[PDB]
Amino acid sequence: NTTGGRFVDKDNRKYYVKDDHKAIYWHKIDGKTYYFGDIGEMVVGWQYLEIPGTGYRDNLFDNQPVNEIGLQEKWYYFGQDGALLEQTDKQVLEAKTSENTGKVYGEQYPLSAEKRTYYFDNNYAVKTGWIYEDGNWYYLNKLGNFGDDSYNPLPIGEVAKGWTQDFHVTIDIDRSKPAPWYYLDASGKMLTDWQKVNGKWYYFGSSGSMATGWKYVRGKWYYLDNKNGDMKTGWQYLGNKWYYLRSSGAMVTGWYQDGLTWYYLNAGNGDMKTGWFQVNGKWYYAYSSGALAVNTTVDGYSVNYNGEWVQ
């Protein structure tokens, strides 16, 4: 909705001039959309810009005041004629690199020999976050790379691979909200259920998020590292209590013999018993190591070879 002007070629740049003024930022002109930066030069190709539509960066000319405004920046694609690609689904385009972004009409730059499928939101911006494609989930980076007073927005919108945290983010990471870990394979597909990664087992369930701590899966209990997620095995001291996990990771309950020694893991909680305890009417004593006492005396009471108390 900007009329009364005309495009102008001058000094190897292109502008839109009306009543002798230069257009700047966003403008809707005769069915298409263009962006002319801060001083009027029409942009082309990949651009990381403040979202249009609010009016604060729209329909403006260099002879008008430009207000302070905090608008998020996102990725957009413009044709070589300056027209914004108003895609709302997806399109295969030249990959955005460190040498084909932020260019203006008349500037010289290479065209990526590599192309990628880019997804877009309903407002023509490159889409970020989770997406569901052909039976699988994919994660499109929400953030670029940080580096001590440094930030590179290039990775944004790209398909994430490997271990990835899904932070809540607008202009910055919302550190108050949760940021679960996920794992996307070589083609970007999100993994589910049990998975062995870098020599260790992890559980991503049905939602994909990496489990931590105790987890009940298909009738058994597993303990995934509270912080790292990796599945534990063997003896583990958790919450001031001992537990024995099979090599499969599953928690053991009942009587267990380690070498020659017998231990009793609580039927309900699975925690190792110490002191005198009773099993199915019978009485037994386990030392502080959890080790069952056999054929000997304990503070006056005798126990046979099965550790059973005998009157």
Ligand X SMILES: CN1[C@@H]2CC[C@H]1C[C@@H](OC(=O)[C@H](CO)c1ccccc1)C2
CA distances from 217 to 199, 204, 224, 309 (A): 20, 11, 12, 37
Residue 218, contacted partner among ligand X, ligand CHT, none, CB below 5-8 A by kind: none
> Which pairs count as long-range contacts for 261-265, CB under 8 Å and 24+ apart, including other chains?
261/291, 261/292, 262/291, 262/292, 262/294, 262/307, 263/290, 263/291, 263/292, 264/290, 264/292
Q: Which is nearer to ligand CHT, 63 or 269 (CB)?
A: 269
Q: Measured from the CB of residue 248, what is the shortest distance to ligand X in angstroms?
A: 4
- Range 234-273, binding ligand X (CB under 6 A): 247-249
Which residues are registered as beta bridge partners of 24? 60
Q: Which is nearer to ligand X, 123 or 248 (CB)?
A: 248
Q: Which is nearer to ligand X, 175 or 227 (CB)?
A: 227
Q: Measured from the CB of residue 256, what is the shortest distance to ligand X in angstroms?
A: 18
CA distance 102 to 277: 74
Binding-residue pattern over the window 115 to 144 for ligand CHT, x denoting contact by CB under 6 A: ---------------x------x-------
Q: Measured from the CB of residue 141, what is the shortest distance to ligand X in angstroms?
A: 16
Stretch of 5-13, 108-116, 170-178, 255-263 lying at the interface with ligand CHT (CB under 6 A): 255-263
- With CB under 6 A as the contact rule, the residue among 40, 45, 52, 290 that binds ligand CHT is 290
Q: Which is nearer to ligand X, 48 or 194 (CB)?
A: 194
CB 128 within 8 A of CB 120: no
Q: Measured from the CB of residue 143, what is the shortest distance to ligand CHT in angstroms?
A: 16
- Range 171-230, binding ligand X (CB under 6 A): 181, 194, 201, 227-229
Stretch of 6-14, 23-31, 53-61, 299-307 lying at the interface with ligand CHT (CB under 6 A): 299-307
Q: Does 256 bind ligand CHT (CB under 6 A)?
A: no
Q: Measured from the CB of residue 262, what is the shortest distance to ligand CHT in angstroms?
A: 5
- With CB under 6 A as the contact rule, the residue among 109, 146, 235, 287 that binds ligand CHT is 235
Binding-residue pattern over the window 178 to 197 for ligand CHT, x denoting contact by CB under 6 A: ------------x-------
Q: Does 97 bind ligand X (CB under 6 A)?
A: no
Contact residues toward ligand CHT (CB under 6 A) are 130, 137, 190, 207-208, 214, 221, 235, 242, 255, 258, 262, 269-270, 276, 283, 289-290, 301, 306-307, 309
Contact residues toward ligand X (CB under 6 A) are 163, 181, 194, 201, 227-229, 247-249
